[PDB]
DNA sequence: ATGAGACGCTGGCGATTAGCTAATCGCCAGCGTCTCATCTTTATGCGCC
């Protein structure tokens, strides 16, 4: 079962991945601004954890093959 | 009062492996008899409401 096919490369391409997204959304979604020259939100990016969301999965019977 | 979450060559070959109707034409077709009787029907020939 542990074949393990992943190689390093693929997780700092995560890492990569995740760094331009979060500031091309972070532009993207957020168009108007306020009055004293800030981004209006109507749309908020959430950055949640990969701990948060296993451990949630582990902690509740809800697991996942 | 820390220790899980992230899993391969396949497609494109050969080369097995397996299996099937169809289109063209030819051949060749159980048959032999008699008796006996039986009925019809036809060709021609003869008659007026």
Excluded at 5 to 20: A, C, D, P, Y
Excluded at 25 to 47: A, C, G, Q
Aim: hydrophobic share 35%; aromatic share 10%.
């Amino acid at each position: 079962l542990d074949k393990a096919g992943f190689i390093k490369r693929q997780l700092v391409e995560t890492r990569q991945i995740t760094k331009h997204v979060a500031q091309i959304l972070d532009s993207r979604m957020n168009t108007k601004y306020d009055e004293n020259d800030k981004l209006i939100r109507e749309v908020k990016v959430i950055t949640l954890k990969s701990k948060l969301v296993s451990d949630f999965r582990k902690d509740f019977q809800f697991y996942k093959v």
